[PDB]
Write a protein that binds this ligand. Structure first.
Ligand SMILES: CC(=O)SCCNC(=O)CCNC(=O)[C@H](O)C(C)(C)COP(=O)(O)OP(=O)(O)OC[C@H]1O[C@@H](n2cnc3c(N)ncnc32)[C@H](O)[C@@H]1OP(=O)(O)O
Ligand SMILES: [Zn+2]
Length: 264
């Protein structure tokens, strides 16, 4: 498509969909990118050289969260646009439907990186509209293929709530969800609902099960409806199975103590 292959840092990623990447570029069979400034080039050489320049070895904004190897940078669409602009171009290679590219300023971009000697490496990000048409904690979410199926999605998902969590403003993802995203949430809400069942041998509410969580009442209910736990209902034998499951190998989980972020 526009195009077939790209080279990120080291890895070569096979795109899923087209991206506006300027005709002149798109046409080129492979699109070399630069791990950090996210600049599209035309050749390995043009890339290979440019890398002596740059000096960018991590995302533009401030680190809001750093624990162990993982980190998130809250990049403002306004402050450092072109990056965000390029993030969208990169992202669209993996989102079938993605409006907004050039108009980045209205969004905040939260980019997750996995860090080592060579730098703070982009592993994926999520989008969030500054001032919301609909109260919408997630506008977009993406994890690069080479990192997928490793719990980075949930991490980002989870992070996105902690954000709205301490906003007091419980939101939800931009609901025309991709197929992949859909499962990511459906399965995240489950885990996080079945979470509290084992962490409160007392029973209470749905609107309380909210707030203390942030998964808005519309959701989580639809989740429970998708379960054998619809009823505004505890399945002690499942709530067990999952908290039993977690004890095998935990996540790559967000630690709220390790996040420096004030709302508004
Ligand atoms: C609001 C919006 O804009 S929606 C946009 C949706 N995004 C996209 O489609 C962009 C491309 N997709 C991606 O970047 C990724 O695949 C994402 C964001 C969907 C998920 O990120 P990942 O790190 O790969 O997801 P993560 O590893 O955290 O876990 C979800 C996966 O675990 C699987 N899973 C199954 N059961 C469970 C469980 N109990 N707990 C956790 N995960 C489970 C899911 O099936 C899913 O796998 P799949 O990707 O093969 O369907
Ligand atoms: Zn660069």
């Amino acid at each position: 498509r526009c195009p077939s292959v790209i080279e990120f840092g080291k890895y070569e990623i096979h795109t899923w969909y087209s991206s506006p990447y300027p005709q002149e570029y798109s046409r080129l069979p492979k699109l070399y990118l630069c791990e950090f400034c996210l600049k599209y080039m035309k050749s390995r050489t043009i890339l290979q050289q440019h890398m002596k320049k740059c000096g960018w070895f991590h995302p533009p904004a401030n680190e809001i969260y750093r624990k162990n190897n993982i980190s998130v940078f809250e990049v403002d669409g306004n402050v450092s646009t072109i990056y965000c602009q390029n993030l969208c171009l990169l992202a669209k290679l993996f989102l079938d439907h993605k409006t907004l590219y050039y108009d980045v300023e209205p969004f905040l971009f939260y980019v997750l990186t996995q860090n080592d000697v060579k730098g703070c490496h982009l592993v994926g990000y999520f989008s969030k509209e500054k001032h919301c048409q609909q109260k919408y904690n997630v506008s977009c979410i993406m994890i690069l293929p080479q990192y997928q199926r490793k719990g980075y999605g949930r991490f980002l998902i989870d992070f996105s709530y902690l954000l709205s969590k301490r906003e007091g403003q419980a939101g939800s993802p931009e609901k025309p969800l991709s197929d992949l995203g859909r499962l990511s949430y459906m399965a995240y809400w489950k885990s996080v609902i079945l979470e509290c069942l084992y962490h409160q041998n007392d029973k209470q509410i749905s609107i309380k099960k909210l707030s203390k969580l942030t998964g808005i009442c519309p959701q989580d209910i639809t989740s429970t409806l998708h379960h054998l736990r619809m009823l505004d209902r505890r399945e002690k034998l499942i709530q067990d199975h999952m908290a039993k499951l977690q004890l095998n190998l935990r996540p790559v989980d967000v630690d709220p103590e390790c996040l420096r972020w004030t709302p508004v």
